[PDB]
Design a protein around this nucleic acid. Structure first.
Lengths: 122, 206, 37, 174
RNA sequence: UAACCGCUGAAAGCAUCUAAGCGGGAAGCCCGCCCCAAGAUGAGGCCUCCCACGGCGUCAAGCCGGUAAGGACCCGGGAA
RNA sequence: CUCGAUGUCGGCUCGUCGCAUCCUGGGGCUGAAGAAGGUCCCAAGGGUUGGGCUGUUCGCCCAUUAAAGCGGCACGCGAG
RNA sequence: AGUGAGGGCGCGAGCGAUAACGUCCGCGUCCGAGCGCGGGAACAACCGAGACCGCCAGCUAAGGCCCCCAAGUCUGGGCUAAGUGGUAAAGGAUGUGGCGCCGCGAAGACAGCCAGGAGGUUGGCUUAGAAGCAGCCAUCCUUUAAAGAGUGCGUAAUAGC
């Protein structure tokens, strides 16, 4: 569901759909890279070419596995942990990416692009 | 602004365009069992009862205390100040309107006797490089010539369940005038299928 | 302005004001707020 | 010799009562303080403050009872109106009845109320002030209003007593 | 009310917030918020109720029944 | 005083007071436009993060943060 | 026969930082070793005072007398009023009260007031401006409210206070 130190997944312009975040970008007292949140990290996994690198950005929270509990008592869980990498502003990293729909995301809102972008099966 | 009750159980419901969860308040309807007139108890107020547990069972005193303004045949009773009795019998079949905010409390389910572990926060000590106490145990208690001894009021092990308490604001959600019941989405303060009460205070400027 | 001390007035006509054992110099220039009580 | 001479014209209700001096004129039944030793008279047209000594306490007391009750009188004679001028591109003003129109906080609700001798005068409103009765409480309320926005040394847009020369300092660099 | 801002005013026959008297003012102080609490011998306040209980050397503040006025005991049950 | 006996570090866990207060606010001051800094007096209310390496508390460094204070109590804590 | 090492206080030199309930020596007292009573809150050595034993006797030290607790909430004359009492220096101040002193042209005072704030006062440099109120000094005259070689708000001098 969350974590501080983390081996997380992504799938943007990733070096590798994996980076380790330090912590949560929220109210100074992290403890939860939580669903639909924004946080900090560097790469863990490799990267053929790609302008990505073995650095560190911050970004926004996708999937989780341990209760995506929504306002409308909409409920879900994906046996997957990953978010999209950000470039400053938030403005996402890559041109596309491998994943899809569901409230929590769009709801957080700031990232419509991610929104229309990851649609279909997967 | 007060309701007397037999707290039922907590359960989930739906509102507007979304579900959320409530609780079951139930109260026949207490009545003017005793009044502190002010000249009577210048701490003026109303004391009432709200049900009835067997009559064959009942001390004379009770029988006549009732006699007083005479009412019925119960045992559930208690009091609250600064609350007029624009009646001489109360139910809530309106008494408590929904879509309103409330404050309320009740008996507090009865814990046990667990130290630094329970009672207080922070789950005990640590575990491994040390096991001659494995995982948790009691913090520290004072010192040499500081106060020169053992302190006097920091949290402490044991019995911390047989007590009572309340919750600040909560929502009145819904009113079922028939079976004198009300759904309120509440911290089920203390058990359920037992005793509670509600009162409303909050000149709270957001 | 203040200082647990000093104060020998200043603004050429800076006022020695007696207020609450409060050695407070009053003038016509903020520069002199002399609070030494 | 000097710190105690004043006449009580108008035949004002110039009298001393329960250890309090009662000065009654246009109505201002002003209560002018009476230190037990100060003492005073009002005969013919002459009203005098006496001095049961002349040391520090007393002498100041003299300057006072004299000046302040003198007040009691001049006051009871007219009605105490404080002349005041509101001025600033950023501000509005009208009596409204019994409050303080006022507007220069860019979220203008300024509904005030008139304490007592206080009558509101909007004849402008650039020129605009109040009338009171009680010289102390009047200068005061006036103040309350001034205070609530008035300041501005470097750029004006405030309320001003008579409106002192408002000393002003430059803004940026030029 | 803290610093800090003012009103009315002398002693310093012009002035000053300043002993005099009045006001402004801090997430802080008493309260308002919940939780204890007359073993606060300085309460108990109110309600109902058995009778002023019955025998003994007056000083009967001792005995026995007195009242199931009530409660305890044992039993049986309890998120206590 | 103590050698017929007082366990010294580092850390842990539970901490308790303190103000020369760090974040908090209240402020007069500015070389104060705004914003933002910086300059003192008032006030402890709550608050006063994770890791790295180093047995080191200090420290230097990563990432934030409103902020990530100094210190009293044998540099609190072995009858924990 | 016993101590053969002791400390404290005051004064006088060491030393030490002219620090320490430091340690060195000396004059004295001290305290132990009596120094058991008073006492100053209570405190081995700071002022009083030597206890052989009594008194339901009286005079006194020191130091005390509103009360807690014996003893005038004495009298008399002041001076502070901050609570100093109820630890502190450097140093700061129209604190408080006191000198022993200076201004009184009732040729009626000072803060408060009124009005004029006088004509050569007009470069000296700089004059873009000094024509007191821009920098290197000027130290004169007439003239009356008695006279500003102009103490001061200032820009372009100047003009106004």
């Amino acid at each position: 569901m969350i974590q501080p130190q983390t081996y997380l997944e992504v799938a943007d312009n990733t070096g590798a759909r994996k980076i380790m975040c330090i912590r949560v970008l929220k109210g100074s007292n992290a403890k939860y890279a939580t669903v639909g949140d924004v946080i900090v990290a560097s790469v863990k996994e490799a990267i053929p070419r790609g302008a990505v690198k073995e650095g560190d950005v911050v970004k926004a929270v996708v999937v989780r596995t341990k209760k995506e509990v929504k306002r409308p008592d909409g409920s879900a869980i994906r046996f997957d942990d990953n978010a999209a990498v950000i470039i400053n502003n938030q403005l996402e990293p890559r041109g596309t990416r491998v994943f899809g729909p569901v409230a929590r995301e769009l709801r957080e809102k700031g990232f419509m692009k991610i929104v229309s972008l990851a649609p279909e099966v997967l | 602004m007060k309701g007397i009750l037999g707290v039922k159980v907590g359960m989930t419901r739906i509102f507007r365009d979304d579900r959320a969860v409530p609780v079951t308040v139930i109260l026949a309807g207490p009545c003017p069992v005793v009044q502190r007139r002010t000249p009577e108890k210048d701490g003026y107020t109303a004391v009432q009862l709200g049900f009835l547990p067997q009559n064959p069972k009942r001390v004379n005193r009770p029988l006549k205390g009732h006699f007083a303004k005479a009412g019925v045949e119960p045992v559930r009773i208690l009091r609250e100040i600064r609350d007029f009795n624009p009646e001489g019998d109360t139910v809530t079949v309106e008494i408590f309107k929904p879509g309103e905010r409330v404050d309320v409390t009740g008996t507090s389910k009865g814990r046990g006797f667990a130290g630094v572990m329970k009672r207080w926060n922070f789950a005990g000590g640590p575990d491994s490089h040390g096991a001659h106490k494995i995982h948790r145990h009691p913090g520290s208690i004072g010192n040499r010539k500081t106060p020169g001894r053992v302190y006097k009021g920091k949290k402490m092990a044991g019995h911390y369940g047989a007590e009572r308490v309340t919750v600040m604001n909560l929502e009145v959600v819904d009113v079922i005038p028939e079976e004198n019941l009300l759904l309120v989405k509440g911290a089920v303060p203390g058990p359920n299928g037992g005793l509670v009460i509600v009162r409303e205070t909050k000149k709270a400027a957001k | 302005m203040k200082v647990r001390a000093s104060v020998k007035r200043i603004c050429d006509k800076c006022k020695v004001i007696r207020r609450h054992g409060r050695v407070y110099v009053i003038c016509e220039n903020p520069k002199h707020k002399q609070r030494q009580g | 010799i000097g710190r105690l001479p004043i006449p009580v014209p108008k035949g004002v209700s110039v009298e001393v009562a329960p250890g309090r001096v009662k000065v009654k004129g246009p109505k201002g039944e002003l209560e002018v303080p009476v230190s037990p030793e100060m003492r005073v008279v009002v005969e013919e047209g002459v009203v005098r403050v006496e001095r049961p000594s002349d040391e520090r306490r007393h002498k100041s007391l003299h300057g006072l009872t004299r000046t302040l009750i003198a007040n009691a009188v001049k006051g009871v004679s007219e009605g105490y109106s404080k002349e005041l001028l509101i001025k600033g591109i950023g501000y509005r003003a009208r009596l409204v009845g019994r409050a303080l129109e006022l507007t220069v906080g860019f979220s203008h609700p300024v509904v005030v109320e008139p304490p007592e001798g206080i009558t509101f005068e909007v004849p402008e409103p650039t020129r605009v002030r109040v009338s009171g009765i009680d010289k102390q409480k009047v200068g005061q309320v006036a103040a309350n209003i001034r205070a609530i926005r008035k300041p501005s040394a470097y750029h004006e847009k405030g309320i001003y007593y008579a409106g002192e020369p408002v000393r002003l300092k430059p803004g940026k660099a030029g």
